[PDB]
From a paper:
Covalent DNA-protein crosslinks (DPCs) are toxic DNA lesions that interfere with essential chromatin transactions, such as replication and transcription. In yeast, DPC proteolysis is catalyzed by the metalloprotease Wss1, which permits replication in the presence of DPCs and provides resistance toward DPC-inducing agents. Intriguingly, Wss1 is a DNA-dependent protease that degrades DNA-bound substrates in vitro irrespective of identity.
We focused on the protease domain, as the presumably highly dynamic C-terminal tail containing various protein-protein interaction motifs interferes with crystallization of full-length protein. While most proteins were insoluble, we were able to purify the protease domain of Wss1b, one of the two SPRTN homologs in Schizosaccharomyces pombe. The overall architecture depicted a compact protease domain consisting of four tightly packed α helices and a four-stranded antiparallel β sheet. Intriguingly, the catalytic center comprising the metal-binding motif was highly solvent exposed.
Numbering used by the authors: 1 to 52, 62 to 127
Write the structure that this text describes.
Amino acid sequence: GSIYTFNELVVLDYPHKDRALRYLERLRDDTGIKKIMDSHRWTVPLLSEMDPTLGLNHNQGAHIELRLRTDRYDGFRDYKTVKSTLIHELTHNVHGEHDSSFWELFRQLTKEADAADL
Ligand code: NI
């Protein structure tokens, strides 16, 4: 497999953490996410669940965090929304500020990752 992936997944110590882990695995394995990480040559050492401000990118892709939960028991955010937050965080591998260049790349990555054939 490709080196352009998330090398380690981490979830928090909340009820149904096995479900949070499956959520991160789904994002890592998402064909659209893989396409853009391959196209843009991104390796992210760590992808974590953010404590339940919907995502973070630390040090240009050393570590990305995503808020998966809507509460502290079994409420989770919808996949489409979290996937798009992940694309936002990946865009911060290149652009620090939410400027025109950021949003241009965000739109291009979004289109790639949403392609109908994947
Ligand atoms: Ni941002």
